[PDB]
Design a protein around this ligand. Structure first.
Ligand SMILES: Nc1nc2c(ncn2[C@@H]2O[C@H](COP(=O)(O)OP(=O)(O)OP(=O)(O)O)[C@@H](O)[C@H]2O)c(=O)[nH]1
Ligand SMILES: Nc1nc2c(ncn2[C@@H]2O[C@H](COP(=O)(O)OP(=O)(O)OP(=O)(O)O)[C@@H](O)[C@H]2O)c(=O)[nH]1
Ligand SMILES: Nc1nc2c(ncn2[C@@H]2O[C@H](COP(=O)(O)OP(=O)(O)OP(=O)(O)O)[C@@H](O)[C@H]2O)c(=O)[nH]1
Ligand SMILES: Nc1nc2c(ncn2[C@@H]2O[C@H](COP(=O)(O)OP(=O)(O)OP(=O)(O)O)[C@@H](O)[C@H]2O)c(=O)[nH]1
Ligand SMILES: Nc1nc2c(ncn2[C@@H]2O[C@H](COP(=O)(O)OP(=O)(O)OP(=O)(O)O)[C@@H](O)[C@H]2O)c(=O)[nH]1
Ligand SMILES: Nc1nc2c(ncn2[C@@H]2O[C@H](COP(=O)(O)OP(=O)(O)OP(=O)(O)O)[C@@H](O)[C@H]2O)c(=O)[nH]1
Ligand SMILES: Nc1nc2c(ncn2[C@@H]2O[C@H](COP(=O)(O)OP(=O)(O)OP(=O)(O)O)[C@@H](O)[C@H]2O)c(=O)[nH]1
Ligand SMILES: Nc1nc2c(ncn2[C@@H]2O[C@H](COP(=O)(O)OP(=O)(O)OP(=O)(O)O)[C@@H](O)[C@H]2O)c(=O)[nH]1
Ligand SMILES: [Mg+2]
Ligand SMILES: [Mg+2]
Ligand SMILES: [Mg+2]
Ligand SMILES: [Mg+2]
Ligand SMILES: [Mg+2]
Ligand SMILES: [Mg+2]
Ligand SMILES: [Mg+2]
Ligand SMILES: [Mg+2]
Ligand SMILES: [Mg+2]
Ligand SMILES: [Mg+2]
Ligand SMILES: [Mg+2]
Ligand SMILES: [Mg+2]
Lengths: 265, 265, 265, 265
């Protein structure tokens, strides 16, 4: 062929070996998406379960995914540092994750909301990015970062929508009322003025959602030395593992991580 | 925050300015997908119509897409060289396209196949890659490359699948019969033994599908010099331009390209 | 070997085919360097000749370099569009150019400055970066950018040092006198206050230095179609072409570029 | 300015934070270089000392370099994992190192070989590449890798050249004699045929050269929390710490590495 040379213009990006990979997916324009389909505000319970169902399905399909954290319209997936899925090609990994979440979300949406058929100009789409982390302390810090943001965003939105719904404020006056406020202020506004105790909100709303792969007889046998069938049996054992869902603090509960050593290696 | 530092590990890739971008999407495991959902062989008309509807819909949402070419389970989209969609971020462009094609396919499938509901373990997924080409001659050669591949593959599958169904050969025997064969050989087997004239095959099957944006009073006004209201008005005309579908040779027809100068600019 | 695996952590960057490469080199910490060895101000003639000699020697060794532009402590080298030097590896190209410039400068320094032996803590070091340009119009604009930069800095330095040297102003007052001034203002300060006609300054100081590869019987014979020994013959011809130095405008003189079409190929 | 837009085509590459950086420099065409200047064989003592001085000089100016290893025409530099030199820009780091090693070599060459002035067509040039390693075990294995290669090449070259110089063999007969041989065969050839004990070779020749930053009162005082003035005092101590040279096994002497914990941080 006189034309096949054009293949030489392609550039693959192989992610640095032996590094933890985070794949973060985030809904595109989900403010508009959540408005169009009338999410309950501040939080739509069934909408989050769709995200979570989507995430668990993806995670059960790919044994390299060790840990998942989701809230709002985002999910973060931790791939083990020795992951060889698609030879660690960033193009493959990211475009497959954004494709899967889109389609899994679309599938499960038709299950949970049969009376809200999707409009062609409002299908659920997601982006995806890969981030490399060379040390597990950065992994701890990454998920702590994301859970802290969930708290802040959930506290704000719960406060915001209660100002609108309980006090019959317009969005603009709700926003202005909150400018200049810290976490303790919003809590006071919610309790004293709206009659809502934030601490009594659902654990899923306050903490977000953790989906983690659970192993029973784990020994830190995973090493560079052993290979071939050992790797393949380990691939099989990872596939035949169980997914558990939690709504807990992972920021300050160090024992939670320590009792799950397969996350680091 | 003591954790937000983790954002610094993210790495963006901004694609070289003033260069043509090709985004190519390809179905994940569509051999299996086409078997599970019982596609007609060698070509399933409605399946391609699902593909064609998706790409046209995608292309109509994004005025920077000037031209698209599809055959089998793939589509290639040409972005104009001064495209600023998502600031030419490689991650954004590819994960958006893979997500869009995925959901549009899923949407249109339910239109064309109400009697074949999608199964959760067989959803339509796509990869997506971006390729840069610094000269339009490479764009012509790229699409020539894909259409030639369309010709070769359709001929093989038409010959292959007529050998199994008409001559009652097994898969191995048809493949074995074809080992060592060129186009004229395949063409003769079709004519003389199977009683099929390849030239009488649908133009879409032979040539594939081209979706192109058409302009009527085009002048090469596009230059770096004019700006402000000038550019946004042309952006408005690009969205309000028409997409026409063709099943024609674009390999050897220079006049086809020459009469479409907006492809170059 | 159980340790040779570490080679797999290396990541090569192959620069996009069929694109103009600009390699720009700029002296590291040459302000201090020029002070340490007591360079003449604003311009040291023998100092610029060391740079030009270094660059020309480099350019005569690497036939892929079609054009070079230098001023101050910098040189830019244009690599032909179809350059395959080190397989277009960015690492090889840039670290080779910075090393070459550093040692050639050092060699020629000992030629031009026998009376100023180099001190180990003040050796001439250079960085180097590669930049891709998909269209020759950006190459024209690149060199225009640099020559304008040359004019601006030379005009400033000539004005600055005439304020210090003729009018016995302090550096601080010379610097404060010029803040907020455009070219017409600086020209007058030189004329009315310093009695200097800027146009009588050396052409090299005003315009910088262009080193160009010159061909006599050139025909645009270059195409993908011609190959094998034909390309090898074109390499010998390119290696053995004459290098000419100019101190002229290249910003506005379109005819200068048009009569040297091999730069575009 | 209408031409300054061309700056936007530049692409920086910021190396992953919190990862070990190895920089390896290697002499360009040093086979030919060592012939032209008539190096002693197998090992030229003064030529290696030129290399060692360059590396030691380079290392004393840049305190982020924690360890260096050299043999033949190569030197590898370990940058501490929290290095912020040039904001971890790969282009700056590599072209600085290739320039520095080249000029330091040229400088020190004139000190050790006043009687062998450098010819302009045979100056000492170096390439340079940055390699990332996410775990310190790879740093150990890297230097193990390079020292093993030094052993292999020095044992071979010493045996080879003793065959040529002592037994008056031609290069070709010496080469075939060594084809198919492991270390014990080569050692025996040295012992039984040439009367040379390899173990009595200089430690520098056998092991290469290790340059290490030595700390006396080191505690792993480095953490993310400590910053500002703590870091500036720490930077000053690293700069004014002492460089010690060793010619010892670092492959298998774990206690050697273990007693130097500042290497991991
Ligand atoms: N010339 C050339 N063509 C290739 C190469 N690899 C794949 N192709 C062809 O390019 C077409 C596009 O398919 P791709 O999906 O991009 O190629 P692939 O083999 O699937 O590689 P990946 O999908 O990236 O894993 C296919 O029909 C392949 O036959 C290659 O390395 N060189
Ligand atoms: N009502 C409601 N809205 C939600 C819920 N989850 C996510 N959202 C919407 O998603 C948004 C999350 O913010 P972002 O993801 O950062 O912004 P975005 O609108 O998705 O736009 P992008 O930057 O393109 O991702 C919120 O502002 C909400 O409007 C939910 O459970 N209920
Ligand atoms: N520290 C820091 N955090 C940011 C920055 N930009 C966004 N974030 C936060 O990071 C979270 C992840 O959102 P992203 O999708 O990565 O950022 P974005 O603003 O949507 O920008 P995109 O990359 O185009 O999607 C957001 O909810 C923001 O709160 C930033 O520049 N610095
Ligand atoms: N029978 C039939 N098969 C089709 C049709 N369209 C696509 N296919 C199948 O899709 C395949 C296209 O090849 P690829 O996309 O390169 O292979 P793949 O199964 O998608 O595997 P990947 O490389 O992961 O994409 C063909 O082998 C066909 O079997 C169709 O209209 N009819
Ligand atoms: N295991 C392995 N070793 C290699 C490979 N390529 C080169 N090496 C070795 O690595 C050592 C370092 O040499 P380098 O200069 O980095 O590699 P090179 O052969 O010179 O190639 P370049 O320098 O990139 O032009 C050499 O002695 C090579 O034998 C490889 O692909 N795999
Ligand atoms: N006296 C004199 N000084 C010169 C001459 N050429 C270059 N220089 C000095 O070199 C400087 C070049 O500035 P830059 O290259 O932008 O900065 P730098 O000092 O080289 O250091 P970097 O920013 O790291 O590149 C000028 O300001 C002068 O001080 C010369 O011909 N004569
Ligand atoms: N328009 C524009 N000009 C720049 C920019 N950065 C630097 N310049 C100017 O362009 C000239 C090119 O020199 P550079 O070496 O690329 O600039 P620099 O600041 O030294 O950048 P680094 O050496 O990479 O740190 C410099 O003298 C700057 O004055 C920029 O981001 N935009
Ligand atoms: N006689 C002698 N030769 C040496 C000495 N040190 C290095 N060399 C020469 O340097 C060469 C090193 O090989 P390489 O670095 O892989 O190849 P190169 O000649 O530098 O060329 P490149 O691969 O482009 O870097 C050896 O083959 C030797 O001939 C020395 O101490 N004495
Ligand atoms: Mg976002
Ligand atoms: Mg979002
Ligand atoms: Mg979000
Ligand atoms: Mg493929
Ligand atoms: Mg496919
Ligand atoms: Mg395909
Ligand atoms: Mg600079
Ligand atoms: Mg400089
Ligand atoms: Mg400069
Ligand atoms: Mg090499
Ligand atoms: Mg070498
Ligand atoms: Mg070497």
């Amino acid at each position: 062929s006189k034309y096949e040379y054009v293949k030489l213009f392609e550039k693959e990006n192989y992610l640095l070996p032996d590094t933890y990979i985070i794949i973060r997916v985030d809904g595109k324009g989900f403010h508009k998406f959540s408005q169009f389909y009338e999410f309950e505000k501040p939080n739509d319970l069934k909408a989050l379960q769709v995200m979570n169902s989507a995430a668990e399905k993806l995670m059960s399909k790919y044994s390299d995914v060790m840990l998942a954290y989701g809230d709002s319209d985002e999910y973060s997936f931790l791939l083990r540092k020795n992951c060889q899925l698609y030879e660690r090609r960033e193009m493959k990994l990211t475009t497959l994750f954004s494709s899967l979440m889109s389609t899994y979300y679309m599938y499960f949406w038709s299950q949970y909301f049969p009376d809200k058929p999707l409009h062609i100009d409002h299908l659920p789409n997601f982006d995806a990015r890969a981030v490399l982390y060379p040390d597990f302390k950065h992994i701890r810090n990454y998920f702590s970062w994301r859970q802290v943001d969930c708290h802040i965003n959930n506290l704000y939105n719960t406060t915001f929508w209660n100002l609108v719904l309980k006090l019959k404020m317009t969005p603009q006056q709700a926003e202005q009322r909150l400018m200049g406020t810290v976490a303790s202020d919003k809590n006071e506004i919610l309790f004293k003025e709206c009659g809502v105790n934030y601490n009594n909100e659902s654990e899923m709303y306050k903490k977000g959602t953790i989906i983690v792969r659970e192993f029973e007889n784990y020994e830190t046998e995973d090493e560079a030395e052993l290979s071939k069938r050992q790797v393949q049996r380990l691939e099989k054992k990872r596939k035949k593992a169980e997914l558990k869902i939690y709504h807990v603090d992972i920021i300050n509960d160090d024992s939670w991580w320590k009792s799950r050593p397969w996350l680091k290696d």
